[PDB]
Amino acid sequence: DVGLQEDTTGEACWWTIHPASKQRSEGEKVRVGDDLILVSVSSERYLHLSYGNGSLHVDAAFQQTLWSVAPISSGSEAAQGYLIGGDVLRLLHGHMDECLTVPSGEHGEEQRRTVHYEGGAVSVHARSLWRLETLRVAWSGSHIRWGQPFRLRHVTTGKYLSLMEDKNLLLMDKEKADVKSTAFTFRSSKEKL
Amino acid sequence: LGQIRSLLSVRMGKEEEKLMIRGLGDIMNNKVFYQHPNLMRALGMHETVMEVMVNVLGGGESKEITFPKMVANCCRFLCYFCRISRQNQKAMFDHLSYLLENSSVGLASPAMRGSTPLDVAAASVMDNNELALALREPDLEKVVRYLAGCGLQSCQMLVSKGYPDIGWNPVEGERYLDFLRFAVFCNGESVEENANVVVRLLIRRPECFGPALRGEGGNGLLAAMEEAIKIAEDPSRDGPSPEEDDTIHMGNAIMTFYSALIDLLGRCAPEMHLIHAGKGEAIRIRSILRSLIPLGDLVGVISIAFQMPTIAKDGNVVEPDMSAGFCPDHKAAMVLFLDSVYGIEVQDFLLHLLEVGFLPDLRAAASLDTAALSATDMALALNRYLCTAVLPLLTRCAPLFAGTEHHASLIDSLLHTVYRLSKGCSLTKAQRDSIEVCLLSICGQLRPSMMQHLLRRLVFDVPLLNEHAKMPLKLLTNHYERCWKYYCLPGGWGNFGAASEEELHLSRKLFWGIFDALSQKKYEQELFKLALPCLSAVAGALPPDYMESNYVSMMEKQSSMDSEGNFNPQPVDTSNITIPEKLEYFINKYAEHSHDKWSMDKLANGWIYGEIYSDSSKVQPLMKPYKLLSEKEKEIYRWPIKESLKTMLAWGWRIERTREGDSMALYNGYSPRAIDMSNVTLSRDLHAMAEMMAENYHNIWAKKKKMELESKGGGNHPLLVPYDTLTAKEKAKDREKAQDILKFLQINGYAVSRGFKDLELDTPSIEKRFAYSFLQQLIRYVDEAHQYILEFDGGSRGKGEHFPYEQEIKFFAKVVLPLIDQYFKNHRLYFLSAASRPLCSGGHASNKEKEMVTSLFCKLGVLVRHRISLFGNDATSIVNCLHILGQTLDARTVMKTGLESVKSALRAFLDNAAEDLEKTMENLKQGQFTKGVTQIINYTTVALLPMLSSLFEHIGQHQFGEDLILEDVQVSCYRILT
Amino acid sequence: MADQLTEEQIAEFKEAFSLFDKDGDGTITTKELGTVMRSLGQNPTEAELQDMINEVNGTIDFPEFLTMMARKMKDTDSEEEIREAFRVFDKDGNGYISAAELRHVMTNLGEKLTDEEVDEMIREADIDGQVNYEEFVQMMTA
Amino acid sequence: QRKRAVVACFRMAPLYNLPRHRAVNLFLQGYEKSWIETEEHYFEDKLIEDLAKPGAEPPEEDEGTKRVDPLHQLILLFSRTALTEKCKLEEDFLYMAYADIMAKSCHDEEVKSFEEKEMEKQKLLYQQARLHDRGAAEMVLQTISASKGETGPMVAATLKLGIAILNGGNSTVQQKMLDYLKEKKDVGFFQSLAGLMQSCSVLDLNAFERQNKAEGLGMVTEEGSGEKVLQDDEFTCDLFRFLQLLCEGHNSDFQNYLRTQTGNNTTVNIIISTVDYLLRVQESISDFYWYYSGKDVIDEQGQRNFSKAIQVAKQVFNTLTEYIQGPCTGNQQSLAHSRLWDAVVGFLHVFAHMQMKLSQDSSQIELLKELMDLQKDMVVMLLSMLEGNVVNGTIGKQMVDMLVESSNNVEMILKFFDMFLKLKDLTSSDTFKEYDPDGKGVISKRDFHKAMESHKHYTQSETEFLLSCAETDENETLDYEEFVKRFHEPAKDIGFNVAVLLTNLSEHMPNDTRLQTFLELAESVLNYFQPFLGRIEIMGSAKRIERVYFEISESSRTQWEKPQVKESKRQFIFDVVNEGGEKEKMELFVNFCEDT
């Protein structure tokens, strides 16, 4: 089984990358667009995708499977600030006195799915945390530029922000977040340029 | 060679094939081919044969190999050429590559073993470290790919010949695995560089492991072996069914493939020294092998039993064909893998494996000890497998046998089976030596007290002093040398315990039997050199003041054992016993209890109620109250209890009527409810009762089954074995119903007791002591030795230098004297004990015992007087014995309470010493300037001085001079002083 | 038969086998399998014959036969392997080789191998330095 | 098997116990191996001269057409055999023997006179003319082409003969080879060269470890020494030496032809094939070094394996330098875009670590010398890459990127060089000469340590490292003359080349912060080499002003700065300024330079 380990001690946490084809070779610098085969140092198995169960699984097997590494983010990070994809943040609406959040004190998703501006300790509670997810898997940890579409996921409830005509803003689940209603953009100014 | 070289230039055909086969035969017949391998290599014969092979294989490469006889003969010639010399092997190694592509030329066709290009390739690297290390990864990769193809696709020619179309090719896979085994294992050591590569390639291609072990729905190795056995014993799936020849026995093929794979992996397993050092690659390989093969599968495969050869009517042996069924070589590989990868490091696992997988095989091999059945293929193969795989494993795992007090029955059965197998014939010298080493190490590690059954078995067998007696003799020597404190010391060895006087009587019988047999046996060098230490060790182990029980335990365990046959069931006759009427109440009550318990068990099984008495509708028992049961139904319960009571009375144990319980019970739809009874306790004597009477019942059943056997005309039922050799689970039923009957006796209170008592207390310790008897025999033998030496002095001086009593004198000089020396050196304090307490255990040898010690000392002195040259090198032995006896002499007590003849002999010893010293006086005087003089001088200087020195040192140390040296002995001492 | 057998003994194996001759296959069956070496001079027992038949179409030839005496070469290997040692060294014959004599017997001759001697004494060390040549050699000449 | 080896040693007997015929066979084999094979006689030059002599033309009475001489006929036969189409180049004993004979005839080989050197050069030219006047160059090209990329003794003999006829950079042979290739439009020759490079062997750790395991098992190889490690170093060196000799003398035409073959339908980049093999051998050397990095000492087999691998790598570096010098801009660009930088990075790591590892030992002096010679060759190749540079050039940018990638290793190398360059100054200081008052030249270890500590130029770690590098002596005394002659002199050459490289990079990348930081790291070496570094500007062959960097010796600087030479310079300047001419100014300057 392939899982997570707290400590780096031992060779179980180490994997060796090998080319999936003859175009690459040992010692050659790995390109971002490539297919790799990963071998566990401890067991000499492969990071393998198994079809045996009704649902696909991942396991360290002797049959080798091709894995493609996709970059997300790098060490640039634009120093401080400069919002990047995947960031968890608070949307301060007014003059540093309100946050976009949902009710939680009432309890119950039926009234927790609504969205509103609230002030006070909401700015330090986890209830007012939204993570910004880009629409592209590759380079999803890059800087967010003006007009770039994204989704806003309420971290605590796990539901995505969305717009429908009859009841304006609302949160739905992963199965109902269908980009047509959950996509939002940041604009420098409100004019319809 | 010129004929073959000329045939190179003509196209191959039938005539040329015949000519070249004959030429190769002539060459392999010639002397120079074997005497001068360098000449052969210089002439390049291997290259010529390889060119012929290439031509034949290329002819019809796509088709079947034309002229297979030519290929087989060339392969055989090249294999022999490789075997001739190492440089020939290295020269043929250069053609390894081509042979690897052409490996599959004739693998599937049988009767070509050792006559294939794969066989030539294997011989090119067999038992050669340089060539094994020179093997390359692509060379092993080709073989791995071929094995994967064999494991994935069936054999075309095999299926064309009508064989069932299984999905894989065990026949060729086995040969590929054998070649890989030769590649990875060389000269008894595993080439780690090749083993790692082979393991990595095999795990990269998991199809190489066959249907089973492939995963993804593949069943276990045990299941695969069982299914292959079913195929082997089921026709229409094993052969084609439209000298093996066409027959392949696909079940055996599958089994052999799996065995070869297991053997190859076990040889690829890393070394334990590397594992201990911590080579991460070694631990990784071991973990991989453990993941592939579970331990339980190996245990189950080992537990699988063979098919014993059967003796049928008219004395005909039916031995199932080895090449068609399950073979011990298949389990040998499993044992090898279990030892190499998993190993045996914990006592509980060792005992479990011994009980489930090894003990049945050992018992079967021991059972196959009949003269006719001991030469069968199964018997020889099983003996080879045992002595080459199983027994060395137990020898190496001997230290794990330390804390085995609980599983006494299991390892007693192990010891009995091993000893019987050793006694069996048709065993090679190496196999017998392996048996000896295994038994020695095992018995050395086990506890002294609980090998009593093996001691008892050896007692009846070793006095014969046959060729096989060497191993039991050494076994007894080592055991009694190690565990002497268990017997001699009254407290015992410690936590081990103390002898129960049964071991003491057994050891005394063994000692006396061995002594008598050696006395009457003609002198043999090795036999005596082995027997004397055994006799000394047994004498030292036995307490000197041991009291021999004049009455033996009634019907002691000699009836169960037999001469030669070693197993004659002897149930006690029940004809003359009459059951007392007072036991009828117990018979009735126990019948009621048994019927109620059986009704409970029947309802618990859940079977249709007994509403009528129906046979086919199978409603037989009626579960009706015992009082309502018929008299003939009562018989099936009463008769076993009747026989039980018959044996109880026959064995002389009283059962008396507890007054309280007897009066107590006398005044005291259907409910089958009975008594929870298993919670009752039994004493030690009660437990021994239950064990011996369950043994009698097992003997009864074994005898009945035996008469059934000769009624059928033959056979050997697996459990027809002595009760001691019978294992715990197999003794469980008899022991349980023993517990049942004794417990019901106890709960009724019916008091069972030993009954027949000792006829007399036997206070004459002075007469019945083991030391008393031993010293009587010793002094007697010294007396005949003395009379023989006077006969020699009478005869040899005239004419009789050679005397008829050579073997008697050799016995006395080789066995008697060292036995005396060792016995009195071990037990010096015992004979020297007196009113004072130099020893703390109690000792205190009798006055008569001390008297005979003195008499023996005097007899030995008289014997040695002027006869050192007659004994030659033994004179050292005589003087050592006299030294020890003089140290052990209890002069004060002997002179206070002793017999006049012995006292006079002790005085005469000193008088003779004084007279000899005076004679030496006149020999040295007036003879220093210029024969009996030399004899007296060297006799004095060699023997007389040490004896007097030791005796006087002992007397001075123990202050015996004030009690011994008085009057005439003072006069003799004055002469000695002058 | 890897050149360890000498020419004279190989020749007398052949002359015994040629006593029955017959084109290298005739009159040499399993019935004469014992008779040839019985005539040659040492006696094959049941163990010797089972060693002959252990790996053995059904009728032997000279390669197979002398291959059998290869594994029989394992016999009579007890006194001549130490005969050379007893001749060259151990003039006293005590077997307890002296201190300088033991330096000298492990004075490495050409191979110049190391750690093997110190391994032997860390695995086993005699006591009474004073290493026994007998105990020293049986460990390898088992 | 340990017991079996001892049993064989005990049972094995000397010669006098062996039967006479066996001992005679053994003696025959030994006599063949020791006396007949080692016997050598020289006949190649005489045989070639006899075969080249035209035979009796007044008897031939032809006078119309000169008949081909026997040597010409033999070369024609070999050429026809090569030209005949076959699946594989069959092994020909005749061709092997006569190719060896011809190569040795051309070869036929304490300061010697100039006329002696010229006489030797003329003799070599005549001997090579004896062959290439009869078709030897075309013959070797045809044989290489017919080899079809398969390594073998035929190809080895062909390469040796080509080297023999191309030694000294034979312009006539180079022109003949190029003309034949261009007029045949032979793609098989270049395909076979690429195949041979791909088939060339490298170091094999697995084979080395298996050989070590076998030797430790205890049975010595009855055959020759194990050549499984670095299979054919001689063949690889011969191939790359033939390639280098094909371009010696800055042969621009054939240098460009190797990179691209214009006429041919298919083109093979010999430049890229060479750099690929360089990368392979660099990786092998790195693996072999890593196998000893943990180990304290390097055995003899390892030392010889490094010697062979370093020789091969040095030959490849020389071949690449011959490729790019002249300069050849196309070759420079191809190597800049090739995998050369990765190999250079690996080599820099290997150098920066093995320098310390072998300098701390005393039994690896020759290995360290070979390694630093290889380092010097690599730096020379890098300088040739920078030859003909331009401001803000792509090659300079890539070299700066490589240096930044290998920053740590180059820093370690520079520290090594700085220590062993200050060694000479402390040796020549008066304090050291009073620590060793006599002129004997050997001083104790703590006298030496106290002398170092007196300077304070070194630190504690540097002093400890130099003491460790100092060899152990029974008298605890070291010879500082041999110490400096061992350690200082490889520096001041490799260090000077590195300083020239860094100065060139700095001057052609004036605005580069990474290079500025790298130079700040390398400040001390540049300060030491500043008086010895000479810069001039020339009107280069590419119609472009180019910087030229060279070495100025201390003796030259002192003689130039002597007052008499200064007065001569002043007089010359006065003359050219006043009565000199602007047309003849450079001629007068060159005459003054020659006289000075």
From Swiss-Prot, chain A:
The free-text tissue note of the record is: Detected in heart muscle (at protein level). Heart muscle, brain (cerebellum and hippocampus) and placenta.
Name where it's found: Sarcoplasmic reticulum membrane
Q: How is it modified after translation?
A: Channel activity is modulated by phosphorylation. Phosphorylation is increased in failing heart, leading to calcium leaks and increased cytoplasmic Ca(2+) levels.
- Domain MIR: from-to ranges: 27-72, 80-135, 141-193
Q: What does the UniProt induction comment state? A: By TGFB1.
Q: Which domain of life is it from?
A: Eukaryota
Disease association reads: Ventricular tachycardia, catecholaminergic polymorphic, 1, with or without atrial dysfunction and/or dilated cardiomyopathy: An arrhythmogenic disorder characterized by stress-induced, bidirectional ventricular tachycardia that may degenerate into cardiac arrest and cause sudden death. Patients present with recurrent syncope, seizures, or sudden death after physical activity or emotional stress. CPVT1 inheritance is autosomal dominant.
Family, according to the entry, reads as follows: Belongs to the ryanodine receptor (TC 1.A.3.1) family. RYR2 subfamily.
Q: So what does this one do?
A: Cytosolic calcium-activated calcium channel that mediates the release of Ca(2+) from the sarcoplasmic reticulum into the cytosol and thereby plays a key role in triggering cardiac muscle contraction. Aberrant channel activation can lead to cardiac arrhythmia. In cardiac myocytes, calcium release is triggered by increased Ca(2+) cytosolic levels due to activation of the L-type calcium channel CACNA1C. The calcium channel activity is modulated by formation of heterotetramers with RYR3. Required for cellular calcium ion homeostasis. Required for embryonic heart development.
Task: Quote the record's domain comment.
Answer: The calcium release channel activity resides in the C-terminal region while the remaining part of the protein resides in the cytoplasm.
Protein name in UniProt: Ryanodine receptor 2
Q: Supply the source organism for this entry.
A: Homo sapiens
Swiss-Prot record, chain C:
What are the GO BP annotations of this UniProt entry? autophagosome membrane docking; calcineurin-mediated signaling; cellular response to interferon-beta; cellular response to type II interferon; detection of calcium ion; G protein-coupled receptor signaling pathway; G2/M transition of mitotic cell cycle; long-term synaptic potentiation
From the UniProt entry, list the residue stretches annotated as the region Necessary and sufficient for interaction with PCP4. 73-142
UniProt xrefs under Pfam families: EF-hand_7 (PF13499)
Q: Where does Ca(2+) 4 bind?
A: D126, D128, Q130, E135
PROSITE patterns registered for this protein in UniProt? EF_HAND_1, EF_HAND_2
What GO terms fall under cellular component here?
A: calcium channel complex; calyx of Held; catalytic complex; centrosome; cytoplasm; cytosol; extracellular region; myelin sheath
The superkingdom listed in its UniProt entry is Eukaryota
The residues that the entry says bind Ca(2+) 1 are: D21, D23, D25, T27, E32
Q: Where is this cross-link: Glycyl lysine isopeptide (Lys-Gly) (interchain with G-Cter in SUMO2)?
A: K22
Q: Which InterPro entries match?
A: CALM/Myosin/TropC-like (IPR050230), EF-hand-dom_pair (IPR011992), EF_Hand_1_Ca_BS (IPR018247), EF_hand_dom (IPR002048)
Q: Which residues carry this modification: N6-methyllysine?
A: K112
By what means is the activity of this protein regulated?
(Microbial infection) Inactivated by S.flexneri OspC1 and OspC3 proteins, which specifically bind the apo-form of calmodulin, thereby preventing calcium-binding and activity.
What does the entry list as the binding residues for Ca(2+) 2? N57, T59, E64
- What does this chain do? Calmodulin acts as part of a calcium signal transduction pathway by mediating the control of a large number of enzymes, ion channels, aquaporins and other proteins through calcium-binding. Calcium-binding is required for the activation of calmodulin. Among the enzymes to be stimulated by the calmodulin-calcium complex are a number of protein kinases, such as myosin light-chain kinases and calmodulin-dependent protein kinase type II (CaMK2), and phosphatases.
Q: What else is known?
A: This protein has four functional calcium-binding sites.
Q: Which family does it belong to?
A: Belongs to the calmodulin family.
Q: Please identify the protein, giving its name as recorded.
A: Calmodulin-1
UniProtKB/Swiss-Prot annotation, chain D:
Q: Would you say which domain of life the source belongs to?
A: Eukaryota
Mutation effect (T596I): In VACRDS; decreased function in release of sequestered calcium ion into cytosol by sarcoplasmic reticulum; changed ryanodine-sensitive calcium-release channel activity; mutant channels are less respositive to activation by caffeine and store calcium overload; affects channel sensitivity to cytosolic and luminal calcium activation
Subcellular location(s) per record: Sarcoplasmic reticulum membrane
Mutation: H508N; reported impact is: Changed ryanodine-sensitive calcium-release channel activity characterized by increased sensitivity to cytosolic calcium activation
Q: What is the effect of changing S524T?
A: In CPVT1; changed ryanodine-sensitive calcium-release channel activity; increased sensitivity to cytosolic calcium activation
Effect recorded for Q174L: In VACRDS; decreased function in release of sequestered calcium ion into cytosol by sarcoplasmic reticulum; changed ryanodine-sensitive calcium-release channel activity; mutant channels are less responsive to activation by caffeine and store calcium overload; affects channel sensitivity to cytosolic and luminal calcium activation
What are the inducing conditions? By TGFB1.
Changing Q559P has the effect of: In CPVT1; changed ryanodine-sensitive calcium-release channel activity; increased sensitivity to cytosolic calcium activation
Q: How is it modified after translation?
A: Channel activity is modulated by phosphorylation. Phosphorylation is increased in failing heart, leading to calcium leaks and increased cytoplasmic Ca(2+) levels.
The signal peptide here is none
Tissues where this protein is expressed: Detected in heart muscle (at protein level). Heart muscle, brain (cerebellum and hippocampus) and placenta.
Domain remark text: The calcium release channel activity resides in the C-terminal region while the remaining part of the protein resides in the cytoplasm.
Family designation: Belongs to the ryanodine receptor (TC 1.A.3.1) family. RYR2 subfamily.
Quote the protein name from its UniProt record: Ryanodine receptor 2
Organism encoding this protein: Homo sapiens
This chain is encoded by the gene named RYR2
The stretch of the full-length protein covered here is 3594 to 4196 of 4967
